[PDB]
Swiss-Prot record, chains A, B:
Record's GO cellular component terms: apoplast; chloroplast; cytosol
Impact noted for substituting R752G: Loss of catalytic activity
Gene transcribed to yield this protein: PPCA
Protein's name according to its UniProt entry: C4 phosphoenolpyruvate carboxylase
Activity control summary: 5 fold activation by the allosteric regulator glucose-6-phosphate. Low sensitivity to inhibition by L-malate and L-aspartate. Up-regulated by light-reversible phosphorylation.
Natural source organism: Flaveria trinervia (Clustered yellowtops)
Main location per the UniProt record: cytoplasm
Amino acid sequence: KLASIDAQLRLLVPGKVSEDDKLVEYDALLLDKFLDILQDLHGEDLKEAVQQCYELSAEYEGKHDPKKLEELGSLLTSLDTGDSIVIAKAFSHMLNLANLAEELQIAYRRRIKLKSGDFADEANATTESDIEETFKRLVHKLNKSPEEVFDALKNQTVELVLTAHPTQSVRRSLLQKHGRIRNCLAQLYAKDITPDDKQELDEALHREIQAAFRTDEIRTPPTPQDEMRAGMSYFHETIWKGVPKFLRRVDTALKNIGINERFPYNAPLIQFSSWMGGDRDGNPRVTPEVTRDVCLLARMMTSNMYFSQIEDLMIEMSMWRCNSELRVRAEELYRTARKDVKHYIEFWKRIPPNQPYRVILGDVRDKLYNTRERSRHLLVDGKSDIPDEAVYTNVEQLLEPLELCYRSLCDCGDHVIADGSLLDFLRQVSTFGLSLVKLDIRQESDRHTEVLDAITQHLGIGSYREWSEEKRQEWLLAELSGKRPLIGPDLPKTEEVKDCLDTFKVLAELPSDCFGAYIISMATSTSDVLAVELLQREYHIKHPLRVVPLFEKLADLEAAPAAMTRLFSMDWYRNRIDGKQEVMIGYSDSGKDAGRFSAAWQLYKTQEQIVKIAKEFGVKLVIFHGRGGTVGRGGGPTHLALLSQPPDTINGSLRVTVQGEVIEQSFGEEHLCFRTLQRFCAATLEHGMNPPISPRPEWRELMDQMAVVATEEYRSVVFKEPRFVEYFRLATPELEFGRMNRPSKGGIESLRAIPWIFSWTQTRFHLPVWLGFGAAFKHAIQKDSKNLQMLQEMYKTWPFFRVTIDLVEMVFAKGNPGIAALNDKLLVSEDLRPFGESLRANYEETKNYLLKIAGHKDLLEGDPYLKQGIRLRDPYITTLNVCQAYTLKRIRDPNYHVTLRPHISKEYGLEDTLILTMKGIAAGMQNTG
Amino acid sequence: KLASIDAQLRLLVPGKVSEDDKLVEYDALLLDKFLDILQDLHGEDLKEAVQQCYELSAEYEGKHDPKKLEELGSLLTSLDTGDSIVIAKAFSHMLNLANLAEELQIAYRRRIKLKSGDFADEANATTESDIEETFKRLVHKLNKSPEEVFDALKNQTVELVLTAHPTQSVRRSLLQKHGRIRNCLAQLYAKDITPDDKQELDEALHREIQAAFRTDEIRTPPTPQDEMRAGMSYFHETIWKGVPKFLRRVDTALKNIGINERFPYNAPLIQFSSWMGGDRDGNPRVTPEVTRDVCLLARMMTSNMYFSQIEDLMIEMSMWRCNSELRVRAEELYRTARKDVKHYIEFWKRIPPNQPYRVILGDVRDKLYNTRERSRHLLVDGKSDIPDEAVYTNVEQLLEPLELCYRSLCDCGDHVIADGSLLDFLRQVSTFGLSLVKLDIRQESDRHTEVLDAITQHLGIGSYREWSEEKRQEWLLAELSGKRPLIGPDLPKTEEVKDCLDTFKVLAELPSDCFGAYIISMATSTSDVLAVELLQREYHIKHPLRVVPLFEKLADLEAAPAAMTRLFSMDWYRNRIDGKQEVMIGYSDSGKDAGRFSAAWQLYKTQEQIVKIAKEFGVKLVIFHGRGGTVGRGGGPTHLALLSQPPDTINGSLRVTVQGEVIEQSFGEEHLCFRTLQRFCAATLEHGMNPPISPRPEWRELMDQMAVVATEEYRSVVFKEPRFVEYFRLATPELEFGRMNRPSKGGIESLRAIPWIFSWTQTRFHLPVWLGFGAAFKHAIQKDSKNLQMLQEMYKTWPFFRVTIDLVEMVFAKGNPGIAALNDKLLVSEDLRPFGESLRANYEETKNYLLKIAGHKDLLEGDPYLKQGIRLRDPYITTLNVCQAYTLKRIRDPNYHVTLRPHISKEYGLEDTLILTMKGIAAGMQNTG
């Protein structure tokens, strides 16, 4: 029964069910159908086993009786390889279904009608300000005129940079199955459904769930080209159409505040970018050829998407009334027109001149087609005979005939028609250009040092690497105005040096609209930035990429201001950057060095300090937000996170990472996609005209004191404990993540931020996110009892503090120290168990101080809808945690034996199970630190 | 205001508004937006004029005060050419909008839950039996087993033959605009609409209405190729997808009566055919080249439609598990696979062998593409180098790889997935084949006589035309077993004779799956059918088309049985037709000869008589229903019409005309499309197992007596009144319909049935539908007062009689003798006005007898939803009737002058106005006789 499954699920999540709360119902219906499918595909016995795992896990999540985890363990460790794989597949699949259901629930959850106005309303999707409410607050509360608001938005840019799913790039095919499951589900709850439609939707739902489950081939890692193409799927699914839907909402909002024009179609309000095939930091599989291929793939896809919708527009543009300008152009094209068959779906004969818009758009289609085919031949054959004037090489060439269509309609009395699909198409072109994402390159500073050292030594003038910072600067500036090239044809090159040089060669050869920033990982100094500038000059790149330092460690953040000041003082550099500089911060990176509490506070300060330095030098600064920050959460929390930024750090230009493990939530469902674009646009606009409060001096002082203590605790555990590393390798699947791939790892310091966060997320322990907050809180409270109240006032009143605590609280809600205890017991040697125990004691204490500061008795009592979503996924994740724990034992320990049950599944090893459990646990945990 | 427009509209149609009745609301909203658009495009003044015409017409339709028609006349006759055209365009457009609204209302009108079981429930869409209810009645009331019902449906065929819109083939582009207006409208009434969505849908609705209005270019008639392509648009809009949606409902219904398999994908339950480019009866513009072109166009479109959906199926069919058979075929195709770019939207690189279903479907796509391109080159270049094994020449070749995909899924445990899009695709292929319509040829008997007369005289053996029927038969049978060809290279040929011979040449050259029946217009005799058989033999056509006589006049219907008996007695013919014969009837044709009452009754008898003769000779008979019958109404009335057929006249095979003026209603909106397919399938099934009652002898006798009297009255008015023709030319726009084109016209007898019906429909008088019923009723009632009760019992109890009266009653509801009176007064000479008056007196008397027999006080009190729809269109049609009447005066009468108002419209002769009024009046009247 459905009702019995509803019953079990409902016990897991008490709450106050009104009509729009269907999430438990959705999950029951999906689980019920998936169980039928399992019985069908694999037999009743296997179905009963899955059920039993689910039941035991759900009971355990109810009362947390250890006994239920043991029974779950006994069952799971008795399964053979074949049955283990089916079970891990089953539970992974259920997590995806649950996520789709949750998306549908967020999409249809009722908006709160009367918002209290407190900034806390912007943390929650049901309460946050939409774009019109944002306009109205600025007008009526901050006394901006409608014209000032309109003018600021017209000059605003929001750039979202997509990074790779750290664990499982989802293929286009499966994504589309997920979308259809989500739709069947929505339609089953449509008002006024006939019984036959319900029966047929039911069978469709069943069929899709099965199709997705059976898309499950398990040998080779995915190539970076395939990872990029997978990572681009969301444009087709939602973003492509989502952009003009949101820009049309902006028109509507403008109209409602008394602005009587549309948002200009070519204002570059939204821009997407990518790191897929561009980031080679610690990753030698990202070669110059990879980068070339992803640029051409992005070009091929973009021109293909315009091509694949142009015929629809041609069909609509049947109108025969046009202006002179377009008439003349149409008759030109008509006279030079081919007498014969074009192998297209729709307009295959010659287009007659009384269909003038079709004649214009017919020529655009041919260009799009050739533009697409050139890219394809360049990818597959290594070059192309297709000439430049047969294709679009600049976006202006594509806009022009569309603009001509627009004006001609306007001039003939049809403005209204122009503002339909034509306007949407113009906006798509202006937003995606000829490459729907611009690609950032990233490489670490030491690689550039190595390249330049090879050059200096071959020149016989010494060793760049040995040179002091002052001497580096001096030589770099001399060569940046040099009169001859640096690199001769006999320069000796190691493979790494060659690889780095040849990247610049790809940058010089490809069009500049393929590229965004050149990010320098591990940047520390002025010379790091000049080094990249010299290499671009040496390759004579016609439009050099802007060079963007990423300062990672705490010490690097502290040295950033002097580095930026020095750059800005240099005439060559000032002239080169033309009033603009972008700097990147990496929350997870900095947090791996110094603990998340101190990284958060330091990043607040460093941003303040760089903003001031930029003003002083008359430079416009963009802060590029790397992964791990409150702004990377997605959903409503992102809205308040953005508003929490230090004053003047946005200033009309937002650039943020959309982390791969967040892209599905942010963009998979069309309503969420629309809301995601909206909150980025609204928050960015608001912040420049309505900064949060600046902190009280007492608050800064306490933050400083707390950071010293947090950093000390985090570093004594992570870096000074001589056996932390050995513990970490036993308690987490960190090593196995490595040997089943980027590459991952000199200890934790040389371990990358993603494997660090990921490994502890897998054990439901999350040490990287919380460690250090505990000592900070305790020390503050014990030094002066009054600090408890100060910290509570900061939570209630200082948006930065509020969002910083909320993220840690969400992570604690995804935690379970029973899973970590189980891993200790199974996997850690006896002499290191006390260490694990003492970390669990810190977890508890740190959680409780956080709760006390937030004024909560229970985790997430602020946010019951989020808590509900996390709780409904828990039983699935827990089953995977237990399966994984015993799998790791079997893999590691040739001594370990258990009696195996006879094979359960019909139809009609260990490493594979582990990869399944790792991916499913990650899909259920989504973002943390 | 919207509310004020709602108010006026509501007065027109009193009734008992529950929540699902929104039609008045829809019409108000559409008119309100269209008025804004008129003001915008053409100025406030013109908007006020339109409004004023609408207001005056709506008032007139309320109380029928003559004064309101006069004022409407004064206003309209004062407009210049430019303003007249804008006004006629405006009112035509509003009629289309109203029709779209009505469609949406029929689609969402609530079903009656408890049906009374009376056959009268099958006349109305809210009460008719759906396919499952049909199954259940057969099982529980007629004691059929589920298996017997399943088996009869599996052997059933429903063939729908599409004919050309008699007045305005609507182009694809405009059709799609209409669809989007209909959707915006539906979405504006969606439950739980946000205000911004409502504002944006509103602006979208406005924009579409404008786009459709401005698709309005007015020189050349449309070529028959363009008329056919226009006429095929409904496949893309609804029928293509509608077929598998209905066949899936059949699966569901079967399951619900205990049949646990799907309806076989290749049972040929549904077949579409066409006359567009095949009918040349009285139409010399339909040449052999036209026929060749429409066959190739149908082939091109069909393969294009499969091509344009195959990539979607490829995307879904990502599964890697396949059986041996498919594995082997995939590895074959993979080895012989091209290394390089295919210029397709989706799978442009070589498909890998671990995507086996994609490999199979990739090869299908290439074949589809080549099949499509061959047809295109044959059309545009006159031939093609594309060889046979590069394309599909038979449908089996396309089914085979799809069947292989199906089996492989089933064999690997994925039956459920197979039954999704794959199953739909299989059904589409089985239903549309390689030519989505098969083409009937039609030509009149006398043309074949003329051809054979040329042959006999060139041979020196006499004149076929002078030969008696017996001598014709004798010679035809001798030559049908002849040993040498008839036609030598020097046969003298007039253009007509050549044209007729060359059609046979096209039939011999093209594939047989392009063609259906060869219909003989004006058939009278056995030799007429043998004549066509001899010509096909002479051209050595490998699969000769079946020859189908159309017996038109009453005398021809009476001679049909002896003609069929003689054919069936001839061994050569029996052997040729292999147990099957199709005969055609033409309701409108027969009604033009003898009056509609007598044609209806005679057609009932003739069908009975031919059915019996077929049984006796062991031949299966199909009766092909031509236009003008109760079965051509569309909507629910069609359901009872089909059930009304004489016993055994369907017998598992239905063939009916879908008239061009009905196609929009039947197929334009996806729910109506689904319901149309459903009632054809359900009624055909039911009838063979549940014939209506056969009439009582007293009823036959009275029907006979009534026919003698009806025919006499109809013929004395139409054929024996020496000035009827002269009256008809003045009172109707018949002549102008001619000189603005098929061709149209020896008096009424040589006038074609469509111009006859059409001309009287235009004046809202409809003489062809009702004339004769009056004398029949009166004579019956006056001969014996008891006949009134007999006729009422027939109405209540005899489905044939009931449906025959209902059609005439619907036509009276579309009538208005005020419009005919106005035409008399304006257009008819004084000495013929009394004639017109006496016809109006007959109209009134005939209507009243009909009402009395039906037991109604008011027209259509049976069917208030239909009455409501007709009444809401009336004001628009009336404005066009008045405009037309004065336009015809101006065109005909150089003496007629009126003072013209200064030009009203901004922006930024007579013949054109007339064509607009004629098309709009026809679109508002839809089907009558």
